[PDB]
Amino acid sequence: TFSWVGRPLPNRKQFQQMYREICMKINDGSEIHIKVGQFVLIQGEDNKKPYVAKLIELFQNGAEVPPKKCARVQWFVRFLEIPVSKRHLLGRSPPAQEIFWYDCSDWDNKINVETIIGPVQVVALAPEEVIPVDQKSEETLFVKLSWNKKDFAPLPP
């Protein structure tokens, strides 16, 4: 379950209150803060890996009733979310830890915070950097490229 931390950010949208941070309690009993700018795993279908998203906004949406805690995200997509026919355009076999910045507006970016599984570390690498492949048996995901529905391209600014 989730709770806001502290005061809302200076108001921007009507009917919404924005927060920098959200508090998530586990059944391991502890409390974890997730902040705007951090990344989360988002529950998708039960047979698939979580979606990965960067949190770009956290908000209490007063336009739903009863009101809900929401996020707006920047999506990433996993290799398997890219059309099979377009996969070869990458020109290599990405590791399971590699994901792609999804640079397209067609999917809606608003989620309910209850779909959040938890934080994930996502790391931006230069194209010529190699993914570790180090130890920690890492839970970290790496991003090199964006995918626009047409081609792979550099990470946006």
Next chain:
Amino acid sequence: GAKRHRKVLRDN
């Protein structure tokens, strides 16, 4: 348990 998010279109 995390609720399921269903991605949906539009809303660009």
